[PDB]
Amino acid sequence: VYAWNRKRISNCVADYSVLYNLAPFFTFKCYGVSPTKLNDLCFTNVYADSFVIRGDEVRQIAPGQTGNIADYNYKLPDDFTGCVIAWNSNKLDSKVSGNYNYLYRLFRKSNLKPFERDISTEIYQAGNKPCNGVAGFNCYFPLRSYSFRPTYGVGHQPYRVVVLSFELLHAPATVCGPKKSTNLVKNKCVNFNFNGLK
């Protein structure tokens, strides 16, 4: 979560209908845009961010929210438009002993500006005494590891998250969905459409 990936999406045709089959039940909260009307208008640039967090923390990924992941690991702007997609993945990222590959920052001097990355691993001095790199008193290592286990409850099982962000610039839109088609007819008074020509 702390080192959340960033991917650029541009110059493509995107079909969002496929995303409804990820899982029988998965959150699909969309902010500022109706999910069913994502195949009509289109944007200039699309950003996709993917990571893994605890299922209960999934409520902290939303505009105007506060918590620990929200202000220390991943913050969304108040005036945010896009969608968030999260589904259960306990079958794919769980170890009986416990997974340790996922880390999250726990201590930070201040909050996080929306859409900011902080990968620093320098020790956190809680108190006034400078420990200078030893995990003793008032000095704790900021990174903590999710100990994912299939025996955990639904409130602690891993949940994969993919966040889509959209916006408009003066550049022409290129990331637009499919337009479908219909078989041709001839020698009959019919209504026709040819690349937006009524």
């Epitope: 794919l92 170890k95 009986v96 002993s97 340790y100 590959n101 290592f141």
Partner: antibody, heavy 121, light 108 residues
Framework: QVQLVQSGAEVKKPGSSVKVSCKAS????????FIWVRQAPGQGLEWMGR????????NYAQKFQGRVTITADKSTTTAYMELSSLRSEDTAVYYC??????????????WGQGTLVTVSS | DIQMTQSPSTLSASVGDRVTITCRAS??????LAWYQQKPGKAPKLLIY???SLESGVPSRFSGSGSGTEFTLTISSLQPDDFATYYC?????????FGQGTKLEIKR
């Protein structure tokens, strides 16, 4: 990418303990996990211990409680294993292997040259 | 502990031949297993982790497939440097067990 050097070959009586070092040079050190794995000439592979020095979680094999302990040094970016109560069948070569945060801690992407320790009378 | 065996224990192959090695565990271990290649006399090298992913520097002709309790590593085109020992290793739950070790050799 990362260059590894282990200790040398050692000959010692069974009634003692052997300390084996492993030095890592290359990339960041705080994002590495260290494992120790055994290679006996008469059979296949078997795993001994697994540790994250930066997170401080240590997990040894179920049949080696109180026999081998693994500790790492941050300043020298080194790891050392000590195994007590050496047995006659414990003559084999030790390999030092590494885990990466970008990837999987348990797996071992790269391997060292190895240390051959033997015991006899 | 998860006890596994890989079959065959020894297989005879030739250059340009297509061969596969199977590796089955006792119970379900999800996809937590990695493939290791060891020339006789030197340290083993990892090839596949997550049972499907290709490590950097590993030729793509190596192919792994598996979901749970049965994994197969497939070679499309063989080269003389492939004659070595391949090892399984699962890392679901503690006490990570290995495989026996399969030997690949040329026909005499």
């Amino acid at each position: 990418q990362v260059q590894l050097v282990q200790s040398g070959a050692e000959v010692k009586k069974p009634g003692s303990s052997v300390k084996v070092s492993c030095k890592a040079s290359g990339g960041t050190f705080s994002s590495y996990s260290f494992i120790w794995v055994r290679q006996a000439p008469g059979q296949g592979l078997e795993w001994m211990g697994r540790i994250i020095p930066i997170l401080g979680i240590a997990n040894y094999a179920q049949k080696f409680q109180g026999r081998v302990t693994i500790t790492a040094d941050k300043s020298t970016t080194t790891a050392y294993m000590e195994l007590s109560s050496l047995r006659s069948e414990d003559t084999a070569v030790y390999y030092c292997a590494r885990g990466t945060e970008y990837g999987d801690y348990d797996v071992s992407h790269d391997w060292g040259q190895g240390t051959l320790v033997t015991v006899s009378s | 502990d998860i006890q596994m065996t890989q079959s065959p224990s020894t297989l005879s192959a030739s250059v340009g031949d297509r061969v596969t090695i199977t590796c089955r565990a006792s119970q379900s271990i999800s996809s937590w297993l990695a493939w290791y290649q060891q020339k006789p006399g030197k340290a083993p090298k990892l090839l596949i982790y997550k049972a499907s992913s290709l490590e950097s520097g590993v030729p793509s002709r190596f192919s792994g497939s598996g979901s749970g309790t049965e994994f197969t590593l497939t070679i499309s085109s063989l080269q003389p440097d492939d004659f070595a020992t391949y090892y399984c290793q699962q890392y679901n739950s503690y006490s990570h067990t290995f495989g026996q070790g399969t030997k690949l050799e040329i026909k005499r």
